[PDB]
Design a protein around this ligand. Structure first.
Ligand SMILES: Nc1ncnc2c1ncn2[C@@H]1O[C@@H]2COP(=O)(O)O[C@H]2[C@H]1O
Ligand SMILES: Nc1ncnc2c1ncn2[C@@H]1O[C@@H]2COP(=O)(O)O[C@H]2[C@H]1O
Ligand SMILES: Nc1ncnc2c1ncn2[C@@H]1O[C@@H]2COP(=O)(O)O[C@H]2[C@H]1O
Ligand SMILES: Nc1ncnc2c1ncn2[C@@H]1O[C@@H]2COP(=O)(O)O[C@H]2[C@H]1O
Lengths: 450, 432, 454, 454
């Protein structure tokens, strides 16, 4: 059995290994620095350390059963997976992350959990889990701000532990900058110790200050360096939030730039005000109903296989409905779908006029069209969704008395979405289908003569 | 008004303003009445009167104004009373309006009324279209978001002060002053991470101050990040124009182009940017719908192209192809539009400016000045293989924008129209 | 006489009108809020205000004599310019900025120079001068920074004056927040007054605090509002500077993104190490020699006439030296120059090999090319700037013994900037010049007969 | 010998000259302002300054021996390099840097290292080394953080020295704002002096405040100016880091925008759930395996010669194994390689179906392809990388039994990435190779006769 890295099981295990890494990256340093935290809950820390070590062994077992993708196929051979795991640097980090440094507990004592700082080397699993999460998640921005908050909180927690350790090394309460005397009942509480250390670290790492000034030279040096780190952290927070803000309304900014450009164009070109209102209403409708970006530009980032398959899933069923293409080969209709060009219209727009040359065949997708009588007040018939016209004009039938000319004016009732198949595209698709072209000409001749 | 259009109507956006200020009353004043003791028996009836006014605004909204909103389904404009009422009930807006009026004298029982925020977002969408230069409202809306975050912070600080006890410690609010602007001042120092406040002593005060400062760090980053995006978006066009203009100056400096040519390029960039706000109008037109692009080209050039004697009787669609192939070219003052004896292969339409035709002895005599809306050089489109030569010097009399269609693009759109191709070729041989 | 708004005289007058506008925007409120400053140097303020009013009148006169572009012509009619000025809101602002309020000095006294606050309505001249200095300067980022800093300094000065006025209204030394008692030997000095007010305003408008806390409710309101204005100011400063940094790094960002994408493609396609190093060296050459720009993308916006003039000034002197184009018509030369495409070759690169299909003519702008044998060790002749090859392959003379194929190996000794002219581009330029095409074919035939390769 | 500026020796010397430049820029002002630092370790400063001046002299020698790029060739003529160096402002700056002012130690005194402030004029070497590292290192973002941090550290150090010198000029311990009395046991130490000045500068430049408020007017003015400079510095830090952050996820932002547009299209068109899931899985595969950017637009950034070299190195070996292209001209093979189009298929995708029209030749760059039967579950043969099919369909052979049709179903077993050569591209490449086209037709005809077709 092998685990697909792109599957849901690998992501579910990535969460299950992220918890011991987060426990080690946050609480090992807290127990190393805050001695009361390590001493009071020692049995719970032993249980959690043993559980995290077990999960680390299982994680090393998972990487021996995680397939890598060569020649487009997932590798299921056990020896290839073992050698791929052992060849990378990750195996060395995983082995170093599980070196039995806990044997020093019987040498140094039960108050030295910094021997488990090698367990921090499994950070790659945490980073891989977060990089997979920022792909899978429905909300990239919410997870991005949550991840930034988590990283800032972890750094603040580490700096709080560092500040408490520096206060311990200097001595609690010897000066006003260090943490005060822990023999005081208020200051001696472990919750008070950690919360005030986190408060100091949050203050210093976010360019707030609001802390007692340093007294000794080492305290001044540490405060200067940690304020510089805090400037970096605050600038990172502001830059991440600003990049998030820019990415969140990037499409809105692009659409607003486009509509401002078209407003400037119709103001400069002395375009009539009714046309200006029509263009502004059209753009507002396109943004409101989520059709702002061109279909050609959207789908060109897809491969040719998926673009054709998506187009087949959209247009093929309607193309079969067209009378001329009803008997066509299933292979031929694939190219005709791929040559369909989207066309959008406004209320009152004329798709075609009577006496115009018909070079396209329009397929109505999400609109209603009217066959007006050169006045715009009466309609022969209203063409609903799935209808079509110009299917005979694209074909070339000799003897057509009204051939190559539109027989009536087609008027869009309102905001119609069409798909045209031009005569040139049909001919270049039929160049590879001679028999189909002849039978289309025969069927069009039959339609014209009936 | 039996049925109103939400996207266009101004009475509807005025009603949206009223609904926003009714919803702003609930959002801003419910935490005030929850935290501050401003909701006393001596003035409770004013609070209840304004709450009834806001609820009446909500009720008038959901009953009258939301049920008569015309909508678009399948592209059609729906106007009848039956469909508009039924369509709104099926939307998320009616679902949120029902839960924004449920009864649930505690001010926290009116917290459902704060859930009518879809009217604010709908009102925001109108202000991004009704008024030009919409980044000004975005700064105001972001500032109002900051003012509300300090407002909630002010209510949270007074609750924390009162819960511990007023004047109990130095960190809590002591009790003197307006009791709102005092706690709002603490929010301003805190949420902007300004500091200067009394230090928190008790564990509850340190935890509250820690989170508040942490929240402020991200709140102050949102204000900067929003302004960074506003400044970048407001100056994006100027930056692109400056980078494009500096790229050509850098290009012209590398090849040692003399300043006589370089100042003409700088003049064109400055004139084109200050006139049309662009550097290429065709880059915008390719992003438009093909019907939008064609209708704009008809609204600009069809009243002129359909008046020249060369393309009379031609196909109307072929003329429509001529308008789409026309390109706007700006000629500098005293620039030679046509040289006497060069290859004539372009048709010029004067959209703006004056063009002088030279002649007489040794040139430099204005035989005629062609104003905007006139077309010259149309005969050149009918020649084959350099058969046309310009018979007179033609210069631009100061910053003329010419719509130019060349012989190559006309011949490319003349193979799709065999009927007009025969007629236009017949008119060529009929005059020579 | 009419002043052209795009000329240097208009910019000089914009500078000349900016100084009274800046003086009115700073020192009028400075004298209104600091009474000692107004009373001590009253004769200097009177002289400067009279001078500024005179410059305002001359500015209105210039506005009546400043032309505008109507249909591309700078209008020089006096009546049309006067009517264009009067129909604009700027005329109303200039009139309101010169309504004589100095007559109110006899009613209110010399202690009230805030009556001249209407002179602030000439801010449009200052803004126009700065927005025109932004375009004219060769250091747009430095001037942008200077403009932002001086705007922030002006706002800080205004807030300092406002804080001093609020301290005066509440009372000097009344509590710990206001400016101290002005009867102090130290705090009673005008310099100390303004400088401490500026210190308070700078600390408050930059969200730094470190100022005595407000005592009164009105003081709390003003402090809250003015730190909010400071939040807006700080956000504007950081956003403008961040947009500046993003714009300056934009070319670096896109070039490095292109390099990273090409490296990712190489890691995808298992491209050999020497080829990867060659491409990395090529991109380092492009960034080091400021050649990352594409000529087509640089000149795409320019019209045909201006791009033609630039291309002529780059290439006509070396295109006329080509033996086939010596007798060519000037318009055909313009077309051929406009159809020249730049190509840059690394050292050791083979531009064409012997037996390769000859599709384009190459013209050397910069660099040295060597005609080498099949091995490539020996060199026949070194081609320099202005030299060319492939002039007969584009012609495609009938009966040619070469047969549209290269007859020699051209190797780039160093980094050569060539400009290729394809046969398709040559025919596209020649389709309007059939007589010149016949002359070109005749010249190619004569060349191929003298060499005996026909 | 002439040092190549784009080589590794030039970068190593850039580091070797940046070390004394950074030493001067960090320590000349420190010894000038902190007099005890200059006096106590004066011998160490003497040897360090002498070594720095020696390295400056060797830097001038390297500049004389640094070749520039003329006509794409490295200039190796010594006198030309001398003239090029002396014709630049950098020679004047280096001469001003190495003006002997240590002779002024006898006049002004041994406690005045302000005379060595001209050594700061070698800043161009430091910036050049930083730019070369930015364009050279494999961690542009980490190096940009390091460079910004070092700039902020040196600016804070300079402001610390400025604050200490201002305190010295005003008087140590005269008021509460200045550095306190230097006769104190604690604050009289040089280490304490420097680190408290650094702490004060760090608070002020990072706009944190929490420093003793100014007393004198000069102190207030300096504090105003220095918090304004600190606001500008903080905005610069935020802008640089935000620009870097936007650059580091510009590819992710673009990819997520593309995926959002695709999802909006699929929801617009009511595309079936399985198809949407397939598209999402495909884009996840693209992001995971670093194949996001399309290869055509990536190769557009390359020059035509270098893109041709990349294409040859990727495709020539696998195109030479095709039986029809077994014995072809080099130019035709290069053009056919340039005509190849990448196609990527998901597992289970059908490249060709039985009855589909064959107008392309597919060459498997990587992946496994199955010649599957009509049932869709039984395969005839698995085609591995380097293999090809459709080599006959691209050739237009008259009288063929199977005309432009696919004989069998081709199914992608896994994520198959392969290149297609269309019939139209092959014909357009063969336009300039008519003999090769005839040979290809003959080879296809003989293959069809051998296989029993035709
Ligand atoms: N009286 C009618 N009834 C139904 N359809 C019509 C009528 N008149 C025109 N049409 C349709 O409108 C189209 C417009 O011109 P076409 O030649 O494309 O083909 C026409 C028919 O499809
Ligand atoms: N006297 C004139 N009046 C009006 N138009 C003219 C005059 N002389 C030249 N033109 C126009 O200017 C054009 C310049 O050269 P063309 O050959 O294109 O055709 C010419 C005419 O269209
Ligand atoms: N001995 C030579 N001296 C100068 N130029 C040459 C020599 N041999 C070849 N060339 C040029 O190099 C070109 C390479 O192949 P072409 O057929 O394009 O035409 C050739 C000539 O223009
Ligand atoms: N049995 C088979 N063994 C190997 N290759 C095959 C087999 N059947 C079909 N092919 C290949 O698959 C291709 C699909 O259709 P073509 O006509 O392009 O040519 C076909 C052959 O190249």
């Amino acid at each position: 059995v092998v685990i697909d890295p792109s599957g849901n099981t690998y992501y579910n295990w990535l969460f299950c290994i992220t918890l011991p890494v987060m426990y080690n990256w946050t609480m090992v340093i807290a127990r190393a620095c805050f001695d009361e935290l390590q001493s009071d809950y020692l049995e719970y820390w032993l249980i959690l350390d043993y559980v995290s070590d077990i999960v680390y062994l299982i994680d090393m077992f998972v990487r021996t059963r995680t397939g890598y993708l060569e020649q487009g196929l997932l590798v299921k051979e056990e020896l290839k997976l073992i050698n791929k795991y052992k060849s990378n640097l990750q195996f060395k980090l995983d082995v170093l992350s599980l070196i039995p440094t806990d044997l020093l507990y019987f040498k140094l004592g039960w108050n030295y959990p910094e021997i488990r700082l090698n367990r921090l080397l499994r950070f790659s699993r945490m980073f891989e889990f977060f990089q997979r999460t920022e792909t899978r998640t429905n909300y990239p921005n919410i997870f991005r701000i949550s991840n930034l908050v988590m990283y800032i909180v972890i750094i603040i927690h580490w700096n709080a532990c560092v500040f408490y350790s520096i206060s311990k090394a200097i001595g609690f309460g010897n000066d006003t900058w260090v943490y005060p005397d822990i023999n005081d009942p208020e200051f001696g509480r472990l919750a008070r110790k950690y919360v005030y250390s986190l408060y100091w670290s949050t203050l210093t790492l976010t360019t707030i200050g609001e802390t007692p000034p340093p007294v000794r030279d080492s305290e001044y040096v540490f405060v200067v360096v940690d304020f510089l780190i805090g400037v970096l952290i605050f600038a990172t927070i502001v830059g991440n939030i600003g990049s998030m803000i820019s990415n969140m309304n990037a499409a809105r900014a692009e659409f607003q730039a486009r509509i401002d450009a078209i407003k400037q164009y119709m103001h400069f070109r002395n375009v009539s005000k009714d046309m200006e209102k029509r263009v502004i209403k059209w753009f507002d409708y396109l943004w409101t109903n989520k059709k702002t970006v061109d279909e050609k530009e959207v789908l060109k980032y897809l491969p040719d296989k998926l673009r054709a398959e998506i187009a087949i899933n959209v247009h093929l069923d309607t193309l079969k409905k067209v009378r001329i293409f009803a008997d066509c080969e299933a292979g031929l209709l694939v190219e005709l779908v791929l040559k369909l060009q989207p066309q959008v219209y406004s209320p009152g727009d004329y798709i075609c006029k009577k006496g115009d040359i018909g070079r396209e065949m329009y397929i109505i997708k999400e609109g209603k069209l009217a066959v007006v009588a050169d006045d715009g007040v009466t309609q022969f018939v209203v063409l609903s969704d799935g209808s079509y016209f110009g299917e005979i004009s694209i074909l070339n039938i000799k003897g057509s008395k009204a051939g190559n000319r539109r027989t009536a004016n087609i008027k869009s009732i309102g905001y119609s979405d069409l798909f045209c198949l031009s005569k040139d595209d049909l001919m270049e698709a039929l160049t590879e289908y001679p028999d189909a072209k002849t039978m289309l000409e025969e069927k069009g001749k039959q339609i014209l003569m009936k | 008004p039996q049925s109103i259009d939400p996207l266009t109507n101004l009475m509807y956006v005025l009603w949206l303003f009223f609904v926003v200020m009714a919803w702003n009353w609930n959002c801003w004043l419910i935490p005030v009445r929850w935290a501050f003791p401003y909701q006393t028996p001596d003035n409770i009836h004013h609070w209840l009167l304004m709450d009834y006014l806001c609820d009446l605004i909500y009720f008038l909204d959901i009953t009258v104004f939301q049920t008569r909103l015309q909508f678009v389904r399948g592209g059609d404009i729906i106007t009848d009373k039956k469909d508009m009422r039924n369509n709104y009930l099926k939307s998320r807006r009616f679902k949120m309006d029902l839960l924004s009026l449920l009864p649930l004298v505690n001010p926290l029982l009116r917290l459902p009324r704060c859930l009518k925020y879809m009217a604010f977002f709908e009102f925001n969408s109108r202000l991004e279209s009704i008024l030009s230069k919409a980044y000004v409202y975005r700064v105001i809306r972001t500032t109002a978001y900051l003012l509300y975050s300090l407002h909630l912070n002010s209510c949270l600080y007074y609750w924390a002060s009162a819960y511990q006890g007023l004047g109990s410690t130095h960190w809590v609010y002591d009790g003197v002053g307006n009791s709102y602007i005092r706690c709002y001042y603490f929010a301003v120092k805190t949420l902007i991470t300004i500091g200067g406040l009394p230090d928190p002593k008790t564990l509850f005060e340190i935890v509250f101050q820690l989170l508040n400062y942490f929240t402020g760090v991200f709140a102050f980053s949102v204000m900067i990040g929003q302004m960074r995006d506003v400044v970048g978006a407001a100056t994006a066009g100027q930056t692109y124009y400056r980078s494009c203009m500096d790229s050509t100056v850098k290009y012209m400096n590398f090849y040692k182009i003399p300043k006589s040519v370089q100042n003409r390029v700088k003049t064109w960039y400055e004139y084109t940017w200050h006139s049309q706000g662009m550097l290429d109008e065709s880059e915008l037109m390719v992003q438009l719908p093909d019907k939008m692009r064609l209708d704009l080209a008809i609204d600009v050039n069809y009243n002129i192209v359909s008046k020249v004697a060369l393309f009379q009787g031609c196909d109307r669609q072929m003329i429509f192809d001529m308008l789409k192939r026309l390109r706007s070219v700006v000629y500098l003052p005293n620039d030679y539009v046509c040289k006497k004896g060069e290859i004539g292969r372009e048709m010029y339409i004067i959209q703006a400016g004056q063009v002088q035709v030279l002649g007489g002895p040794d040139g430099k005599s204005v035989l005629v000045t062609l104003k905007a809306g006139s077309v010259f050089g149309e005969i050149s489109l009918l020649a084959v293989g350099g058969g046309n030569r310009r018979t007179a010097n033609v210069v631009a009399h100061g910053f003329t924008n010419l719509f130019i269609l060349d012989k190559k693009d006309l011949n490319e759109i003349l193979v799709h129209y065999p009927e007009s191709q025969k007629l236009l070729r017949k008119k060529a041989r009929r005059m020579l």
